[PDB]
Ligand binder design. Structure first.
Ligand SMILES: O=C(NC/C=C/[C@H]1O[C@@H](n2cnc3c(NCCO)ncnc32)[C@H](O)[C@@H]1O)c1cc(-c2ccc(F)cc2)cc(O)c1O
Ligand SMILES: [Cl-]
Ligand SMILES: [Cl-]
Ligand SMILES: [Mg+2]
Length: 213
């Protein structure tokens, strides 16, 4: 089987159903003690938690679910009625993510869309009845952060105040995205220095608040 499958199976073997914290702890323990994986991790995860609590978003979009770690992190802090949409192009990983959310008991708060962001983003208004997004978490292929940011704007999905939160702006890095948002009058940016998941390597999150056209 695969590492992701091994991570899910460890969660099922060990964690408690309906308890999102126990799910996050299990994943952290497995990835610290057994096999590293590219979950956002606890260091950056705590920063994400603080952002989520600050802005209290009603509708969050995640690009790149992977195994569902960040989806569990975010969804457990949403106010009743608030929702997360997460896009994952790898069908195997989309299934892992759905099962992770099911185990955590968060399935009513989250929709896991199996497809590529460039294909799904243009469908959000008509097919998923989205007006605008309150927050976007970017954590997919690093060379797609900028194209997808620009596509979200083209599609009318950003509003004045939409919070973009981008993982991995140091390692692996997203140099075009980071230069773009920091140089644009349409974004107000804040850098949160942290550490690569499960590693003593500096990384960080960038928050970029959309200012309108
Ligand atoms: O590469 C990293 N992330 C990529 C994420 C991929 C996930 O997102 C999914 N995905 C990709 N593109 C899209 C897409 N749209 C675009 C494609 O059409 N639409 C939907 N889903 C998409 C994939 O299927 C995966 O589930 C990374 C690396 C390190 C790292 C650091 C240090 C190292 F030494 C090694 C690695 C640390 C991290 O935190 C990282 O996030
Ligand atoms: Cl994650
Ligand atoms: Cl960590
Ligand atoms: Mg990441």
């Amino acid at each position: 089987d695969t590492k992701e499958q091994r991570i899910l199976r460890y969660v099922q073997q060990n964690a408690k159903p309906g308890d999102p914290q126990s799910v996050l702890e299990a994943i952290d323990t497995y990835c610290t003690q057994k096999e590293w994986a590219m979950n956002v991790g606890d260091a950056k995860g705590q920063i994400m938690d603080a952002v989520i609590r600050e802005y209290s978003p009603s509708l969050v979009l995640e690009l790149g679910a992977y195994c569902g770690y960040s989806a569990v992190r975010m969804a457990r802090l949403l106010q009743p009625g608030a929702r997360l949409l997460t896009m994952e192009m790898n069908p195997d990983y989309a299934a892992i993510t759905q099962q992770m959310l099911n185990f955590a008991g968060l399935q009513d708060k989250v929709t896991i869309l199996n497809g590529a962001s460039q294909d799904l983003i243009p469908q959000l208004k008509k097919k998923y009845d989205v007006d605008t997004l309150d927050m976007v978490f970017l954590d997919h292929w690093k060379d797609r952060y900028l194209p997808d940011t620009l596509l979200l704007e083209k599609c009318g999905l950003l509003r004045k105040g939409t919070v973009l939160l981008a993982d991995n702006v140091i390692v692996p890095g997203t140099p075009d995205f980071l230069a773009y948002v920091r140089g644009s009058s349409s974004f107000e940016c804040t850098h949160y220095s942290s550490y690569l998941e499960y590693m003593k390597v500096v990384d960080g999150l960038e928050k970029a608040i959309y200012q309108g056209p």
